[PDB]
Write a protein that binds this ligand. Structure first.
Ligand SMILES: Nc1ncnc2c1ncn2[C@@H]1O[C@H](COP(=O)(O)OP(=O)(O)OP(=O)(O)O)[C@@H](O)[C@H]1O
Ligand SMILES: Nc1ncnc2c1ncn2[C@@H]1O[C@H](COP(=O)(O)OP(=O)(O)OP(=O)(O)O)[C@@H](O)[C@H]1O
Ligand SMILES: Nc1ncnc2c1ncn2[C@@H]1O[C@H](COP(=O)(O)OP(=O)(O)O)[C@@H](O)[C@H]1O
Ligand SMILES: [Mg+2]
Ligand SMILES: [Mg+2]
Lengths: 52, 512, 173, 460, 171, 52, 458
């Protein structure tokens, strides 16, 4: 019986962890789309062509 | 204690681990799709056996490098794909995670976890396609693998590093015998691996639940490919399972691996190959079907300490590792002479043949002597087991043949009568319950009682009672000898005298 | 699809064109041949089971402003083997072989924002470091990248888009 | 707007050319106007050049090269849920009865993924059918597969109707019936026999009639399966009847042959085991509900080694055998207690009392068969008192295996009976161990519980 | 979709001049070598069943005459041959030494002595492939061929000009 | 034992609501070299917070 | 100078300039990451394309790798320096000892010896096993083949032959491990070294885990070494672990080479592949090779084309059967199918021939009585048919024998039976002079003495 309950603890931990992961990338998506309509694009592409 | 803060810290750590700078990659396009087979245009830098990443998290294996295309197979549901999707090339040859942190997990053939436990911890990757250690690197097998059952430890002994095929018809106890072998290694320091190819899913969950119920699960890795999943996943399932077992072998440890149905893997290779139009041979399998089971099973081996030292760069000295394999083959109507059963019989170190006529007669486990053999020899067995077992195997085979002719006519000459009585009592003594393993001390007492004649004056209907009472008697009073025989399997005249006294006193003094 | 049967004709025609140096003229000849193959009335004829000689000479009568000695004789060989539909692919592979021989490459630059001329200049210089060939940049504008630049040298791709960085991060977790 | 064009028409196989960026996916559904009727095509292979090869779900006659093909971005979708009970449908979820348009609260795609591991029930429950022979001798796992090895003429359909009735009344489940490869005559009068027995309101019907092209017959099984999946997701325990699994295997073989894939084994398709696994692994017990399945099996050439039986037997849990001989005795249902078996009969899942009782009645009936041969050759005078006791109890056991169905009232006139498992166990326990030796064997016949047997005896 | 020995330098030769000159129809070039079968390009005058001479002293038999290819089988060790070797068609069908002097000799199928007893003293050459005598040129078989085994000579007679099958398993 | 997880399920998801906002902002600036002043980003992360 | 252009399984296609294309069976070489890979040329295709079999792992090959053209075949170390050592298909040392100090190397592709060079001998070479010598006598310088399905004893029988033949043989020997278990070879090597006989045996190993090219060409390599020791004028013993695998490797490669299948999916050139190898393992006027070849038969089918064509290439053929092994009778030789070219009255004498034919006649009659015995049982037989059955059963049991290499299984001591003893025993049993002993007395006894002695022990 103890082994069974330990497995449940692991399952709950992972379930909640998955929710936070996907919501985190969704939030980064929403932050970025609104905030990038600038010459910040030039910053990124300059570093890319320097690395290229 | 479930704790939110530690999860948040881990997510932040993943953000820190991510590197934003990109890397140049060779790319290609899907051109055609059918039955899990793929034809790709591009990928000038690809290599045969490479892993190609498709849209989503799915992957594909490059099989043919044609002049102007690549032939590949999807490792999952292929129906969601369409011509023109971009595919990137990971130079990684087909690989899967390995490490001792895998014990107690249920895992897909691609290394992804199938249980709800979470992400997986591994000690790097090992390649799925590899060539086994050569002739000079091998070592002779010299240590036992004590499974629970009386019959296969006494008549068909298995040594660490041996390959032994469990063969029989459907619903004959193959699965039960294999997992009871796993369960009895729970305390013997041998790591276990179970590879399920093509089984119905409910079965697999029930098997894992029974492994947990006896506490063996913490010592096992379980690899799963259900009957619902794409044929390529099934075909590659045993190779992934083999790749994990080699980790323990090369570090000087001992491991045990079960392949639940190699016949179903052979069917999978039929489907992939015939979908690639390769001309068939006998029973419609390709001639490559020998090479398949050959290179898979030949990885199971015992390696000498010089190989272990050279492999581990000298971190382990003097130890010798091993991988023990119990493949399972389902055969139609008990025909041992069909193609694939004959191929695997040509590869293993022996076979354990389970007969449906014995099983239906209630003689379980239904091991058939004469057909079952262990070609490794008695070198696997301990001293007391080797001395007490002796000719019991051939005596049983001869008893069965004599029963065959005795059914036909009446010719009883008193030695035939006693031979028949002895054989019938021995067969009644060999049968055993499911999930009921018994230690070498108990097995040696049983064999001693059988062959030193003590079962004289004992009824056949009393044989099971006689054993239950005897093992309780020896558990109660002469326990220290049991501890001694279980520690060192030593057969001396001192120990024979003690056993003789125990059986004399039990037969004279006790009841059953 | 004629990708695999086009290679021998593309290679042989290119070698012959090189020996007589009129590579550009050969490319014109093949372009003309590829466009006649797309015609509605010709694409019906090319699928019919006429004997190669009659079919070829109808095509040759239609194929004015080609060289009798060499180009129209390439037509004869392709007619014999029943491969005139390979011309739209032989043309592309001839152009590829020419690009390889002329040590010159064509690459695509893709971004959500129309690129400034200085960005394109530095891209061309860097690519000519990475690639021995001189580079002709092609400008494509697509909101997909959301930001950054996607470098596409055919099969060789360097991804510099924010969206790519994001959907790469999503699988790390 | 339609965007594909047909390139070839060769029998049931039809090839279609779409624009290079829009090539429809595998098992997507497409529609064309074949004259003044729409015809549904199912995509099978994505060939080069933007051409997909399809199979016509209907007669492919009258198709021209160059028709316009319309791309539905989903697989074939069918209606699901309570609105489908009592209706009859074809492959496409269209009503083939004349009762008109269906309610269609929801429409679902037949091609679906299977239940995954963490969704499977962490338990191994049994289903109480209420029929004495089945619950005693061949118990069903809840969510298991059961094989019906009998030819028509012995009561297959009345058994099926009795299970439908009992699972609807004595539980809260519904049933789905999938008539794969069924003669039209049978479909007609199976429909009549269910409507005149009041079970029709508790079952859904999908018929693939044999006059349909091979593509139709193959996907008929999947349609019934997805309707059962809807009833499972609602939280019920559901029964799915497959009228012949062998016909599904053969439809797969025919389609694979038409597409030109290389044959395997005894001429079957290379994908035989995969296709069977795709069907059978969806029928399981989940954590919300379950689908139990009862499947009629035909064994080619009476050969149990042939790949179709050999593949099917990998999935069956229980096995019910119907006997012409038992039926001739007047015993109904005509289940054979010695050849019917279930891999649920172990103490570890079914308990020691039930196991020892089933083993006991099996032993008694087998010994009775041998003694009946002895009686045939040498008369009853050879039997000892022990032998006569065995024969008497065997006759009482055999009588006690009969049962009156709520569906059979039309013939017997006796009210139907549902017998709980405990009552069955107690009855055979008692008869085996010599109780009720004092009342005659005809008190046990067609009565019901053992209490009802003794109360029948008192004035018999 | 497949190639048919249309390959780069051959195509370039035809590009330079489509109606390539008559040259000699007598000769050609090996384009493939595998498992004792060779494919030859050219040989416009090779007859079906004719011997083709190969470098060294070796021969092949033209068995397939196809559209700009000859398939030929090599009558000896083939693995020494190579692509691009010239070959010339003879006018000859396969012929073998024949005569009374062959009695007592052991020969290979080309009639070359293999016993080492020296050269043959044959009586000219005969074609390996030939037509049988017609219906009007036969005569009925009536003379015996004495085998010496009681069972055969009694129950299964063999006469001069008979064709008697001996059939059974190994050993 | 299962009932105890239910109380924590809610308790912990409430903590992860507020931690998600932090993680999303950090990930956005990991993707993009330039930082964000959050002028119009509070409402964004509040919607993220509301959903978990 | 060449480029890889297609990669199909174990088969690799390489493009070369038109003036530089390799010959057939030349060896090419490729860098496969940090490994070296050898490719053997099989076919020349049109246009400088050449098609090859990888003598090693095909994994990790890209297209476009540079291939180097070594202008000679696969050549292996040869002669007295190759003795007591274990080697790769490519002639590389696989034991951990140092370099092989060879003075000479030979190409593995060679022409067979001439008909004028051959030799014949009637000299009986006694082998201890009772059944093989009486039923199928094997002469020195000839070929012996052990036919059997999976797990019927054709490896163990060969180990008994190795033990017994090495008693009266003084010269060198070669062992070719072709597509079999690595463990069998490892165990063999340590048995040889622990008995100090290794100094006279040369070993080549190509076992069943290696890719198809290795298993295909490993056999030819072993023949190269055996032919060296023959051509030095010695007499040589050549043991082949499994010749079936050699044909099967060709099957595995065949379809990838672009060849239409023949018969039961086999390569169309099967008979020539078998013949071209078999005709050079032969004796000559300068020296003689004696060879034992294990012949696996698939699915116990003795009519399968590969075993069927193998039968014609052997002098003595011993046919093992699973039905006899299942009865406990080992060595499980079937006397009604095992045969030898040497069983002639002139070669073995009239007693040796008459005893063998009596044994066969009695056993053959036993077979014809089995159907009536099956249906009706023995009591409906004629009164001398019962006697035939009794003597046939005794003969069947006396064919069994304890082996010195089977002590690890039986536990019983092993036995060696000379010719002047076994024919005496069988002649006496046939004439009924030992008919009074019971059947069990003849099981696993060496000589007639041990049978009557065992009958005294019941
Ligand atoms: N020792 C035993 N005593 C009694 N019954 C046993 C014993 N071992 C196994 N069984 C029974 O054998 C039956 C089938 O077992 P198992 O699943 O191992 O068989 P199998 O031949 O491997 O089956 P399948 O081919 O379906 O995988 C079960 O009912 C189980 O209870
Ligand atoms: N003389 C014998 N007495 C008893 N058992 C024997 C004897 N000879 C062979 N066997 C049995 O045969 C088994 C396998 O032997 P062996 O390796 O020679 O067989 P095989 O047919 O060559 O098999 P494979 O092709 O798999 O290598 C032995 O382990 C043993 O059980
Ligand atoms: N429970 C039952 N009661 C009365 N008759 C039955 C019963 N079961 C089967 N039968 C008889 O068997 C015959 C065939 O029954 P039917 O339901 O048509 O069989 P199937 O379903 O196999 O075609 C009928 O005469 C029917 O009366
Ligand atoms: Mg199993
Ligand atoms: Mg062996």
């Amino acid at each position: 019986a103890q082994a069974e309950i330990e497995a449940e603890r692991k399952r709950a931990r992972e379930e909640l962890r998955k929710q936070v992961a996907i919501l985190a990338v969704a939030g980064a998506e929403k932050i970025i789309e609104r905030s990038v309509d600038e010459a910040a694009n030039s910053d990124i592409v300059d570093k890319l062509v320097a690395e290229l | 204690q479930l704790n939110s803060t530690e999860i948040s810290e881990l997510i932040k750590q993943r953000i820190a681990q991510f590197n934003v700078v990109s890397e140049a990659h060779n790319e290609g396009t899907i051109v055609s799709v059918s039955d899990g087979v793929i034809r790709i245009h591009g990928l000038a830098d690809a290599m045969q056996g490479e892993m190609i990443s498709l849209p989503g998290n799915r992957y594909a294996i490059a099989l043919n490098l044609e002049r102007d295309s690549v032939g590949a197979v999807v490792m999952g549901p292929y129906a969601d794909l369409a011509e023109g999707m971009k595919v990137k090339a990971t130079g990684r040859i087909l690989e899967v995670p390995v490490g001792r942190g895998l014990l107690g997990r249920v895992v897909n053939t691609l290394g992804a976890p199938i249980d709800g436990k979470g992400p997986l911890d591994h000690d790097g990757f090992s390649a799925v396609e590899a060539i086994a250690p050569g002739v000079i690197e091998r070592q002779s097998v010299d240590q036992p693998v004590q499974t629970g059952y009386k019959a296969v430890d006494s008549m068909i002994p298995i040594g660490r590093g041996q390959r032994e095929l469990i063969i029989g018809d459907r619903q004959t106890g193959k699965t039960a015998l294999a997992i009871d072998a796993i369960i009895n290694q729970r305390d013997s320091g041998i790591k276990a691996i179970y590879v399920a190819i093509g089984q119905k899913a409910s079965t697999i969950s029930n098997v894992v639940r029974k492994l947990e119920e006896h506490g063996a699960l913490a010592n096992t890795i379980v690899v799963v490919a259900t009957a619902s999943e794409s044929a390529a996943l099934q075909y590659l399932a045993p190779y992934a399972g083999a790749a994990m077992g080699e980790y323990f072998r090369d570090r000087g440890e001992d491991a045990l691996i079960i392949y639940d149905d190699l016949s179903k893997q052979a069917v999978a290779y039929r489907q992939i190959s015939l979908l690639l139009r390769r001309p068939p041979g006998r029973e419609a399998f390709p001639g490559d079907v020998f090479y398949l089971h050959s290179r898979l099973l030949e990885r199971a081996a015992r390696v000498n300490a010089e190989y272990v030292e050279a492999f581990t760069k000298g971190e382990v000295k003097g130890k010798t590792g091993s991988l023990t394999a119990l493949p399972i083959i389902e055969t139609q109507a008990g025909d041992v002479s069909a193609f694939v059963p004959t191929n695997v019989i040509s590869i293993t170190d022996g076979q354990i043949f389970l007969e449906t006529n014995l099983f239906n007669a209630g003689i379980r486990p239904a091991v058939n002597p004469g057909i079952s053999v262990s070609r490794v020899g008695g070198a696997a067995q301990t001293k007391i087991m080797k001395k007490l077992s002796g000719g019991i195997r051939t005596a049983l085979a001869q008893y069965r043949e004599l029963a065959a002719f005795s059914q036909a006519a009446s010719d009883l000459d008193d030695a035939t009568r006693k031979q028949l009585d002895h054989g019938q009592k021995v067969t009644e003594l060999l049968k055993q319950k499911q999930y009921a393993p018994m230690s070498v001390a108990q097995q040696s007492l049983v064999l001693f009682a059988a062959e030193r004649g003590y079962l004289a004056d004992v009824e056949l209907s009393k044989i099971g009672s006689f054993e239950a009472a005897l093992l309780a008697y020896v558990d109660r009073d002469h326990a220290p000898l049991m501890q001694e025989i279980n520690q060192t399997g030593g057969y001396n005249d001192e120990i024979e005298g003690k056993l003789k006294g125990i059986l004399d006193s039990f037969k004279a003094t006790q009841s059953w | 699809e004629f990708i695999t049967v086009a290679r021998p004709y593309a290679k042989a025609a290119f070698d012959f064109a090189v020996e007589h140096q009129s590579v550009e003229r050969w490319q014109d000849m093949l372009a003309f041949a590829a466009e006649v193959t797309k015609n509605e009335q010709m694409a019906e004829l090319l699928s019919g089971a006429l004997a190669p000689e009659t079919l070829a000479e109808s095509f040759i009568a239609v194929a004015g402003e080609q060289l009798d000695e060499n180009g129209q004789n390439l037509i004869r060989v392709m007619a014999e083997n029943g491969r005139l539909n390979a011309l739209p692919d032989v043309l592309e592979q001839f152009i590829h072989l020419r690009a390889v021989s002329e040590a010159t490459a064509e690459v695509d630059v893709i971004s959500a924002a129309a690129l400034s001329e200085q960005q394109l200049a530095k891209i061309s210089a860097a690519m000519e470091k990475r690639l021995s060939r001189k580079v002709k940049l092609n400008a494509k504008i697509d909101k997909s990248v959301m930001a950054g630049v996607i470098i596409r040298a055919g099969d060789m791709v360097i991804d510099g888009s924010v969206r790519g960085r994001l959907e790469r991060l999503a699988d790390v977790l | 707007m339609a965007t594909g064009k047909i390139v070839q028409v060769i029998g049931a196989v039809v090839d279609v050319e779409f624009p290079q960026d829009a090539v429809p996916r595998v098992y997507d559904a497409l529609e064309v106007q074949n004259g003044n009727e729409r015809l549904v095509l199912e995509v099978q292979q994505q060939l080069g050049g933007g051409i997909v090869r399809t199979i016509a779900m209907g007669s492919s006659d009258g198709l021209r090269r160059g028709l316009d093909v319309k791309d539905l971005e989903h697989p074939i979708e069918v209606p699901v849920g309570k609105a489908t009970l009592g209706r009859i449908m074809n492959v496409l979820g269209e009503p083939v009865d004349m009762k008109g348009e269906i309610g269609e609260e929801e429409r679902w795609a037949i091609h679906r993924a299977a239940p995954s591991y963490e969704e499977l029930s962490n338990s191994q429950e049994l289903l109480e059918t209420g029929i004495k022979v089945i619950d005693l001798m061949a118990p069903f796992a809840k969510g298991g597969k059961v094989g019906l090895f009998g030819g028509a003429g012995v009561g297959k359909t009345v058994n099926m109707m009795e299970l439908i009735r009992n699972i609807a009344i004595e539980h809260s489940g519904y049933s789905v019936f999938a008539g794969v490869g069924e003669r039209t005559r049978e479909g007609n009068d199976f429909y009549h026999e269910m409507t005149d027995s009041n079970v029709i309101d508790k079952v859904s019907l999908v018929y693939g009639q044999m006059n349909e092209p091979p593509g139709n017959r193959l996907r008929v099984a999947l349609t019934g399966l997805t309707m059962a999946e809807k009833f499972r997701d609602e939280g019920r325990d559901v029964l799915l009847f497959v009228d012949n699994i062998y016909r599904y295997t053969l439809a797969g073989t025919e389609v694979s042959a038409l597409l030109g894939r290389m044959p395997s084994a005894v001429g079957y398709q290379p994908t035989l085991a995969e296709e069977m696994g795709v069907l059978q692994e969806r029928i399981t017990s989940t954590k919300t509900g379950s689908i139990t399945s009862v499947q009629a099996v035909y064994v080619p050439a009476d050969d149990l080694t042939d790949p179709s039986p050999a593949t099917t037997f990998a999935h069956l849990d229980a096995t019910v055998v119907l006997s012409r001989q038992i039926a001739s005795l007047g015993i109904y249902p005509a289940v054979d207690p010695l050849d019917s078996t279930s891999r649920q009969l172990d103490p570890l899942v079914v308990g020691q009392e039930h196991y020892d009782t089933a083993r006991g009645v099996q032993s008694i009936l087998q010994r009775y068969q041998e003694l009946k041969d002895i009686i045939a050759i040498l008369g009853m005078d050879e039997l000892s008192e022990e032998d006569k006791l065995v024969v008497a109890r065997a006759r009482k056991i055999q009588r006690f295996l009969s049962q009156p169905f709520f569906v059979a009232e039309v013939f017997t006139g006796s009210p139907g009976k549902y017998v709980s498992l405990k009552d069955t166990i107690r009855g055979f326990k008692g008869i085996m161990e010599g109780e009720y030796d004092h009342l005659p064997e005809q008190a046990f016949y067609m009565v019901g519980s053992i209490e009802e047997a003794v109360e029948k005896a008192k004035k018999l | 979709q497949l190639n048919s020995t249309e390959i780069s330098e051959l195509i370039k030769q035809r590009i330079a001049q489509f109606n390539v000159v008559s040259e000699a129809h007598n000769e050609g070039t090996i384009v493939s070598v595998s498992d004792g079968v060779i494919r030859i390009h050219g040989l416009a005058d090779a007859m079906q069943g004719e011997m083709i001479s190969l470098p060294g002293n070796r021969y092949a038999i033209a068995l397939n005459l196809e559209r700009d290819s000859v398939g030929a089988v090599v009558m000896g060790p083939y693995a020494d041959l190579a692509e691009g070797m010239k070959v010339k068609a003879t006018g000859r069908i396969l012929e073998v030494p024949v005569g009374r002097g062959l009695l007592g000799r052991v020969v290979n199928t080309l009639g070359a002595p293999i016993d080492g007893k020296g050269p043959l003293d044959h009586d000219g050459f005969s074609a390996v492939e030939a037509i049988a005598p017609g219906v009007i040129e036969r005569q009925s078989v009536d003379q015996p061929v004495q085998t010496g085994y009681k069972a055969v000579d009694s129950m299964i007679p063999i006469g001069r000009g008979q064709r008697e099958l001996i059939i059974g398993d190994r050993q």
